[PDB]
Amino acid sequence: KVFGRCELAAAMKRHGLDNYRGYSLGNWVCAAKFESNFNTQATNRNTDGSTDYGILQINSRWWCNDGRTPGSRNLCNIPCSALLSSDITASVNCAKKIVSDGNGMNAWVAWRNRCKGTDVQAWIRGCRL
């Protein structure tokens, strides 16, 4: 599923991301935009052989199991494929664990490089929330 901006803002809000560990909703929408262009089915491979999955590009090296990342961890206890669902629940729940691990949203490179320090509220402007 390719989410619209406000559609996604509302789904994330419903799933408890607004102000989760101090990150306003705009932060999450912005990250999703630049990580996956709002596409739940996004996948990208990394040099180390790991793969990033879903709307928030969660990495198989530590968070999910894809059966092809030797030596990896599965800290969200889920198959990576679950992160590709049109239902963002698994992605959100795992993201909550990631953002809570000490490094905040810096775990998401696109967030750090394209959202951090910007006017992220612009991403939810005009949306009915």
Q: Which residues are catalytic?
A: 35, 52
User: For residue 81, with 0-12 CB atoms within 10 Å meaning exposed, 13-18 middle and 19 or more buried, which class applies?
Assistant: middle
Among the listed residues 36, 59, 65, 91, the single contact to Na ion using CB under 5 A: 65
Q: Does 69 participate in binding Na ion (rule CB under 5 A)?
A: yes
Give which of Na ion, Cl ion, none residue 104 binds (C-beta under 5 to 8 Å, depending on kind): Cl ion
CA 36 to chain centre: 9
Three-state DSSP class for residue 43: strand
Is 18 assigned to a binding site?
no
* E runs forming strands in the chain: 43-45, 51-53, 58-59
- Using the rule CB under 5 A, give the single segment among 7-15, 33-41, 60-68, 94-102 that binds Na ion: 60-68
What is the rounded end-to-end Cα distance, in angstroms, of the chain?
20
- Closest contact distance (angstroms) between CB of 87 and Na ion is 21
**Rounded to the nearest whole angstrom, what is the least distance from the CB of residue 22 to Cl ion in the complex?**
6
* Interface contacts to Na ion, rule CB under 5 A: 60, 65, 69, 72, 74
